[PDB]
Curated annotation (Swiss-Prot), chain C:
<feature type="topological domain" description="Cytoplasmic">
    <location>
        <begin position="9"/>
        <end position="80"/>
    </location>
</feature>
<comment type="similarity">
    <text>Belongs to the transient receptor (TC 1.A.4) family. TrpV subfamily. TRPV3 sub-subfamily.</text>
</comment>
<comment type="subunit">
    <text>Homotetramer. May convert from a homotetramer to a homopentamer to allow pore dilation. Interacts with TRPV1; may form a heteromeric channel with TRPV1. Interacts with SNX11; this interaction promotes TRPV3 trafficking from the cell membrane to lysosome for degradation.</text>
</comment>
<comment type="function">
    <text>Non-selective calcium permeant cation channel. It is activated by innocuous (warm) temperatures and shows an increased response at noxious temperatures greater than 39 degrees Celsius. Activation exhibits an outward rectification. The channel pore can dilate to provide permeability to larger cations. May associate with TRPV1 and may modulate its activity. Is a negative regulator of hair growth and cycling: TRPV3-coupled signaling suppresses keratinocyte proliferation in hair follicles and induces apoptosis and premature hair follicle regression (catagen).</text>
</comment>
<protein>
    <recommendedName>
        <fullName>Transient receptor potential cation channel subfamily V member 3</fullName>
    </recommendedName>
</protein>
Length: 532, 113, 80, 113
């Protein structure tokens, strides 16, 4: 009621009131409807754009005042705008209207009680569409364009070199935007955020200059690590007596194995150093991501520690010299699938493997055993009470022997328990062919479990997981060598607005045709790659 | 195979899949083929009898072929001539046989999309 | 359209075949149905406040109409 | 046949008109004693609605869910259980009664075999 509102403000009603009632409700989707406690944000959140403009003409109105949660107003509009494009999009329109009506830069620097900028709050809750506005934000004026986040430099018709602004975005300070976005759990539209331009090219930047060249060195070092572990079982001097030493010290010449056997044990220490940190950081990451990612850091840790634990066992002799090695050696060639990142071609075929084991193989497995246990008991109780091979069955597992004679028909068989049977032994080819067909439908129907917009969704969600699982390792290889970060690139803090030309570090992108507007927004006198 | 529009479609897609997906199939399939083979090749002599009856060829690679031919055609005696609770020798094949099959079933999806 | 229809009709049959057993487990124990929930017959219209047993659901944005249709003085989970 | 009109819409299963009877908001107050929905809070985006539940739940003889689920002869039956005073009510008892009774019928029958 804007008409009743005018008399109330004219009567002298307080407009900087608060509200600390029970209606916050941390279980947000019921009985709640958070404000930001002020009458101004309640005007803003509930689409009263006449009243928001009305409440800012009054000089008694404060803006910078905070909440019980510490929130100012532009925190609050972020915490309401949900993931639905163009729901007559007003939060993007009204977050605009509050800055341009009033404000210097001193609104986006204030922290909440969690110590977060509004740009950080939009990332940590992951409300993507409003973050598209903050990182773009072109302001086509010049009394107040010191609030912008994009800058156009050239004004040359179709081509134009744009400058994004990059203040808190890159991991150059504590708790930056990419550190929030990629390491986070709890959000589901995460790949729909890394499409956005001041993030999409910046991941691509370091994959040109830092990560990919560091990545294959981590591959080629780990690749020779598994061959050296392999070559104590091939062991080209084919047999000597019985090999009483798996990983020995070889006080003997031909140092290639002396450097070789020590090359394994060194890398077992480095994985023990590096993935012992995985407890110190990943306290909620693993149980929340119960089926997604970051589990290989445990599985690298299972592998490499058991290499050393064989060598401790070799001096205490619990007979498990070879036993602890080999049944843990097999992960060393199985863990190579971590390095299937790196090609967009190879990445798609990599993700869908772990997709099907979690989705459909266990769906396949519970029913397949249920028929495997099903028709087996009818045949195992057949094998001795009637149905001859009278005395010739004294070998192993009178139940389970018939199970294997029904198990191998899935894989490979053709045997004599048909030819050495009785009780009209054609019946023994009824109660297999009931099994063979009933595997096949349970095997054919798994194709349909890999259908259902698998044409559409699966080869799109594999793009969704792969770009993320590249993006985690790139930010890890920033934090892996804090030695000399001389090749972080920044365009060298060109002019923003003022006489303060050395202002803040920037970036460069370029544009194309469609709607040839005129130009007073630029910076320079139509230059090129001006080196001079 | 040029010459029929009918014959041409079936001709092109052969060289499509060898470049796209067979080499995608091949790098992972060898990675498990090399994977479960070493566990079984180190099984074949240190424990697990066929004690003296193994003096023929390639003590590592012989077990690889006994794990390789199950893709193609086999049914043999290294199950029946083994030890160390030889039902275990039908655990560490059926971990292989199913894990080929998902890597073989997922190639259908590589010919989808 | 096994891509389309079959993995949709399997949703059509499954929600029904769950729904049959739930109504069977109502009728299986007629012993003590103390945990049937009803919100306790709040006011409908009249001075007859104890009227008939009800239920609760919640709504969202899109077309902010004004309001004279309600019952109470904007309360919450009013336990008192 | 001894049927209310709400029962007749279910027993013949003509779904779209049943969406009207179970919703039925009447935005007045000389005659809103005929409604079947009630809005309680008036607080902008959030609002707590009250469906009315007279003959719907199986509390009397020949109720609505007893008609809908046990029936044959109709083909759009899943298109009716999308509708809100039925969709959440099945979900209600699966939280409080059925699912806890269900796995006991599984675990008793599992050890039976």
């Amino acid at each position: 009621q804007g008409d009743i509102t005018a008399v109330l403000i004219a009567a002298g009603a307080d407009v900087n009131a608060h509200a600390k009632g029970v209606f916050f409700n941390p279980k947000y989707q019921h009985e709640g409807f958070y404000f930001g406690e002020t009458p101004l944000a309640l005007a803003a959140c509930t689409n009263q754009p006449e009243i928001v403009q009305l409440l800012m003409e009054n000089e008694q109105t404060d803006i910078t005042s905070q909440d019980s949660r510490g929130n100012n107003i532009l925190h609050a509009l972020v915490t309401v705008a949900e993931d639905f494009k163009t729901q007559n999009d007003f939060v993007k329109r009204m977050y605009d209207m509050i800055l341009l009506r009033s404000g210097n830069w001193e609104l986006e620097t204030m922290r909440n009680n969690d110590g977060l900028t509004p740009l950080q709050l939009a990332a940590k809750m992951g409300k993507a569409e409003i973050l598209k506005y903050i990182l773009s934000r072109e302001i086509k004026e010049k009394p107040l364009r010191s609030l912008s986040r994009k800058f156009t430099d050239w004004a040359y018709g179709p081509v134009s070199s744009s400058l994004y602004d990059l203040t808190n975005v890159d991991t150059t300070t504590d708790n930056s935007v990419l550190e929030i976005i990629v390491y986070n759990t709890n959000i589901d539209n995460r790949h729909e955020m890394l499409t956005l331009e001041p993030l999409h090219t910046l991941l691509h930047t370091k994959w040109k200059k830092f990560a990919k060249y560091m990545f294959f060195l981590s591959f080629c070092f780990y690749f020779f690590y598994n061959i050296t572990l392999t070559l104590v079982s091939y062991y080209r001097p084919r047999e000597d007596e019985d090999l009483p030493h798996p990983l020995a010290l070889t006080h003997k010449m031909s140092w290639l194995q002396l450097l070789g056997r020590m090359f394994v044990l060194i890398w077992a220490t480095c994985i023990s150093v590096k993935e012992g940190i995985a407890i110190f950081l990943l306290r909620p990451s693993d149980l929340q991501s119960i089926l997604s990612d970051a589990w290989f850091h445990f599985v690298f840790f299972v592998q490499a520690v058991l290499v050393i634990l064989s060598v401790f066992l070799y001096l205490f002799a619990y007979k498990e010299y070879l036993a602890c090695l080999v049944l843990a050696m097999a992960l060393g060639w199985a863990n190579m699938l971590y390095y299937t990142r790196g090609f967009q071609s190879m990445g798609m075929y990599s993700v869908m493997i772990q997709k099907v084991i979690l989705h459909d193989v266990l769906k396949f497995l519970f029913v397949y055993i249920l028929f495997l246990l099903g028709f087996g008991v009818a045949l195992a109780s057949l094998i001795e009470k009637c149905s001859k091979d009278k005395k010739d069955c004294s070998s192993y597992g009178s139940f389970s022997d018939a199970v294997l004679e029904l198990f191998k028909l899935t894989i490979g068989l053709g045997d004599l328990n048909i030819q050495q049977n009785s009780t009209y032994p054609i019946l023994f080819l009824f109660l297999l062919i009931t099994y063979v067909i009933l595997t096949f439908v349970l095997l054919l129907n798994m194709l349909i479990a890999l259908m259902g917009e698998t044409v559409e969704n699966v080869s799109k969600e594999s793009e969704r997981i792969w770009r993320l699982q590249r993006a985690r390792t790139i930010l890890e290889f920033e934090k892996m060598l804090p030695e000399w970060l001389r090749s972080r690139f920044r365009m060298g803090e060109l002019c923003k607005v003022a006489d303060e030309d050395f202002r803040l570090c920037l970036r460069i992108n370029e544009v194309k045709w469609t709607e040839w507007k005129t130009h007073v927004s630029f910076l320079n006198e139509d230059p090129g790659p001006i080196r001079r």
